[PDB]
From Swiss-Prot:
It catalyses: N-acetylneuraminate(in) + H(+)(in) = N-acetylneuraminate(out) + H(+)(out); D-glucuronate(out) + H(+)(out) = D-glucuronate(in) + H(+)(in); 2 nitrate(out) + H(+)(out) = 2 nitrate(in) + H(+)(in); L-aspartate(out) = L-aspartate(in). It is a multi-pass membrane protein. It comes from Homo sapiens (Human). One of its GO terms (biological process) is sialic acid transport. The keyword Membrane applies. Changing H122R: In ISSD; alters intracellular localization, only partially targeted to lysosomes and mainly detected in LAMP1-negative vesicles and in the Golgi apparatus; abolishes H(+)-coupled sialic acid transporter activity; has normal L-aspartate and L-glutamate transporter activity. It is linked to Salla disease: Sialic acid storage disease (SASD). SASDs are autosomal recessive neurodegenerative disorders characterized by hypotonia, cerebellar ataxia and intellectual disability. They are caused by a defect in the metabolism of sialic acid which results in increased urinary excretion of unconjugated sialic acid, specifically N-acetylneuraminic acid. Enlarged lysosomes are seen on electron microscopic studies. Clinical symptoms of SD present usually at age less than 1 year and progression is slow. Infantile sialic acid storage disorder: Severe form of sialic acid storage disease. Affected newborns exhibit visceromegaly, coarse features and failure to thrive immediately after birth. These patients have a shortened life span, usually less than 2 years. InterPro entries: MFS (IPR011701), MFS_dom (IPR020846), MFS_Na/Anion_cotransporter (IPR050382), MFS_trans_sf (IPR036259). It is found in: Basolateral cell membrane; Cytoplasmic vesicle, Secretory vesicle, Synaptic vesicle membrane; Lysosome membrane. Changing K75E: In SD; alters intracellular localization, only partially targeted to lysosomes and mainly detected in LAMP1-negative vesicles and in the Golgi apparatus; completely devoid of L-aspartate and L-glutamate transporter activity, but retains appreciable H(+)-coupled sialic acid transporter activity. GO terms for molecular function: carbohydrate:proton symporter activity; D-glucuronate transmembrane transporter activity; sialic acid transmembrane transporter activity; sialic acid:proton symporter activity. Residues 70-75, 119-139, 188-218, 289-304, 352-362 are cytoplasmic. This is Sialin.
Length: 427
């Protein structure tokens, strides 16, 4: 079709690759360890460090991305991020042969390469997307992440079953490379730099962004962002991501050790939760708009209601899943419900940053993500240390503490959230 939508059909696949290279290990690990590929004798704590080392890098390059993107554009940044991630993915096997240290190091470098994507995309859309249309283009671009954390698990299971685990990494790295070639050939960082764009589209985009860009006032300065209504968003994000990452990283292990599912079935059934989450975050915005039309609700009742739901429903159903372990089906159903209701959050704390201080979101997202990334560095560690022997009495404990985290986060948000403006964003 046009140029901007082609960019949004190349960013979709880029984020697909991002999240696939992020998630594939959660599956490949349950076959890389011992009780036709090579198998290593990782202990418990070691698997946790391996699964967490990605976020020790993801956290480093989240905010610096916003600066490096305004410096050298978004195209090369995202391209090199994906390329480094994929090339290191190719070497992950040769690294495992060298030990665990190199493996965690390689995953952390993957994290450095991956964390610089979203800021680059924001930068590119700040020059490509007209305001009346970026709500759709950003959605297209970011749905690739959900599709990736949906599809990289079934494919990883298929491959690890019919073939060795090495081929997961080989295939996904080759894909990342064959995508970087396109990202380099076609895309540009700004319309006037595009080589095959038409004059009318260029003028439409520039005329849409003219007054908006010339109305920027809050760029060259930044006030004190230590207002409690921001720590509420940060805490809710930390809480949600604790559960989300703990599962993303240790759910296949649960399905293979406790439920005793095959690897194929493991990868196929570990996608249902995130597919449900996708559908739920697709329907939640519609429902919230229809609700604000039904009644005013001050635009804050919506945030806190949807947050309460998407952070307590998960807790309840996850506790229930832990309570009835060793059942093939009901536990899968309850984990699915748990990570499905978690999609209501896309109309709560994951959006309050646009109502609290717009025109400053570029850095509020960075703060929130940099704070809510810590659980990726912790959860997979203690959730596996508490379970040296994968007995249901151990997993119940991590489920309980994760549910308590979700609950405390929801309480904090409901108490201290604001939804109109915070008096320092006023340009």
């Amino acid at each position: 079709c046009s140029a901007r939508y082609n960019l949004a059909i190349l960013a979709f696949f880029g984020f697909f690759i991002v999240y696939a290279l992020r998630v594939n290990l959660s599956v490949a690990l349950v076959d890389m360890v011992d009780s036709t590929g090579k198998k290593y004798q990782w202990d418990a704590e070691t698997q946790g460090w391996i699964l967490g080392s990605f976020f020790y890098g993801y956290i480093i390059t989240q905010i610096p991305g916003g600066y490096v993107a305004s410096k050298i554009g978004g195209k090369m940044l995202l391209g090199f991020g994906i390329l480094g991630t994929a090339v290191l993915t190719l070497f992950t096997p040769i690294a495992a042969d060298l030990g665990v240290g190199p493996l965690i190091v390689l995953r952390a470098l993957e994290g450095l390469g991956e964390g610089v994507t979203f800021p680059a995309m924001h930068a590119m859309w700040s020059s490509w997307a007209p305001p009346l249309e970026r709500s759709k283009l950003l959605s297209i671009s970011y749905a690739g992440a959900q599709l990736g954390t949906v599809i990289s698990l079934p494919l990883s299971g298929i491959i690890c079953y019919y073939m060795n685990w090495t081929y997961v990494f080989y295939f996904f790295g080759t894909i990342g490379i064959f995508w970087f070639l396109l990202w380099i050939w076609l895309v540009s960082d700004t319309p006037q730099k595009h080589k095959r764009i038409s004059h009318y589209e260029k003028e439409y985009i520039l005329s849409s962004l003219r007054n908006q860009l010339s109305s920027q006032k809050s760029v060259p300065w930044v006030p004190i962002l230590k207002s409690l209504p921001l720590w509420a968003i940060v805490v809710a994000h930390f809480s949600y991501n604790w559960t989300f990452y703990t599962l993303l990283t240790l759910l296949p292990t649960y399905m293979k050790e406790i439920l005793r599912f095959n690897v194929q079935e493991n990868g196929f059934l570990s996608s249902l939760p995130y597919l449900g989450s996708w559908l739920c975050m697709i329907l939640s915005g519609q429902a919230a708009d229809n609700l604000r039309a039904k009644w005013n609700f001050s635009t804050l009742c919506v945030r806190r209601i949807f947050s309460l739901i998407g952070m307590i429903g998960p807790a309840v159903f996850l506790v229930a899943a832990g309570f009835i372990g060793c059942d093939y089906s009901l536990a899968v159903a309850f984990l699915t419900i748990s990570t499905t209701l978690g999609g209501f959050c896309s109309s709560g704390f994951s959006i309050n940053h646009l109502d609290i201080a717009p025109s400053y979101a570029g850095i509020l997202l960075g703060i929130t993500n940099t704070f809510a990334t810590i659980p990726g560095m912790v959860g997979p560690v203690i959730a596996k240390s508490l379970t040296p022997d994968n007995t249901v009495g151990e997993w119940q404990t991590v489920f309980y503490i994760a549910a308590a985290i979700n609950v405390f986060g929801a309480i904090f948000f409901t108490l201290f959230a604001k939804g109109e403006v915070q008096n320092w964003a006023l340009n």
